């Protein structure tokens, strides 16, 4: 809402060369990221090039009428206000051999957040708005796993993936719902 408008307003006032340089720095990070143990979020400075007044963009999910601001990390402060980029995952700038993981609560009293993520189906398309770029991902896999069974958020060579992660069943939170999309061609209108 206000936060998303503010983000896009700020970006539109930024220097084209700086936007380009920031983007390449994110790509460099994604090109050199080593596999690491990725923990369940519910129970740094490395993304600084993406930060615009602490936000790194937003995730747009037309299937559930959501546009949710994104931040770095999964602390409770972050998750009370938007979605968080998971520690150890790729930055949300795409590229071959990348897998970004974006997490949000299955609803809060005053924001639906990922409450309706269970409504998403294979073929649905969601969009990551990062700096002045918009990256489209099409849902190709939906699984629910125990917090201990987290292999599906790992980097797969040759692919460009983005997973939306929340808790499930609603209010029972015994498991995690992972909605995986694969990059499809899309560029924001100029």
User: Can 167 be counted among the known catalytic residues?
Assistant: yes
Two tokens, residue 85: 């980029």
Q: Are 83 and 71 in contact (CB under 8 A)?
A: yes
Question: What are the boundaries of each domain within the chain?
Answer: 1-190
Return the DSSP state at 70: E
Q: Are 72 and 86 in contact (CB under 8 A)?
A: no
Resolution (A): 1.7
Minimal CA–CA distance to 42: which of 126, 118, 106? 106
Minimal CA–CA distance to 1: which of 47, 55, 74, 73? 55
Two tokens, residue 104: 């949000």
The three-state secondary structure class of 113 is coil
- Give the Cα separation of 133 and 54 in Å (integer): 17
Measured in degrees and rounded to the nearest 5, phi and psi for residue 28 equal: -60, -45
Rg (CA), the chain: 15
Catalytic option among 53, 99, 129, 167: 167
> C-alpha angle 164/168/173, rounded to 5°?
120
Two tokens, residue 168: 């499930």
- Sequence-distant (6+) residues with CB within 8 A of 91 are 26, 29, 30, 47, 50, 85, 98, 100
How buried is residue 16: exposed, middle or buried, by Cβ count under 10 Å (0-12/13-18/19+)?
Answer: exposed
Measured in degrees and rounded to the nearest 5, phi and psi for residue 54 equal: 80, -25
Catalytic option among 53, 99, 105, 129: 105
- What torsion, rounded to 10 degrees, do the Cα atoms 40, 94, 186, 85 define? 30
> Cα 102 from chain centroid?
3
Q: Are 4 and 58 in contact (CB under 8 A)?
A: yes
- Give the Cα separation of 179 and 162 in Å (integer): 8
SS3 for 128-166, per residue?
A: EEECCEEEEEEEEEEEEECCCCCHHHCCCCCCEEEEEEE
The CATH topology of domain 1-190 is Sortase; Chain: A; (2.40.260)
User: Can 157 be counted among the known catalytic residues?
Assistant: no
């Amino acid at each position: 809402n206000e936060v998303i408008k503010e983000f896009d307003e700020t970006v539109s006032q930024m220097d084209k060369a700086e936007l380009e340089e920031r983007w390449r720095l994110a790509q460099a990070f994604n090109a050199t990221l080593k596999p690491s143990e990725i923990l369940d979020p519910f129970t740094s400075e490395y993304a600084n090039m993406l930060k615009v007044h602490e936000r790194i963009g937003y995730v747009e999910i037309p299937a559930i009428d959501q546009e949710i601001p994104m931040y770095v990390g999964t602390s409770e402060d972050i998750l009370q206000k938007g979605a968080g980029l998971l520690e150890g995952a790729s930055l949300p700038v795409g590229g071959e051999n990348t897998h970004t993981v974006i997490t949000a609560h299955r609803g809060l009293p005053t924001a639906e957040l990922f409450s309706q993520l269970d409504k998403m189906k294979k073929g649905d398309i969601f969009y990551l708005h990062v700096l002045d770029q918009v990256l489209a991902y099409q849902v190709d896999q939906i699984v629910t796993v125990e917090p201990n069974d987290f292999e599906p958020v790992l980097i797969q060579h040759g692919e460009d993936y983005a997973t939306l992660l929340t808790c499930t069943p609603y209010m029972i939170n015994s498991h995690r719902l992972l909605v995986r999309g694969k990059r499809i061609p899309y560029t924001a209108p100029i």
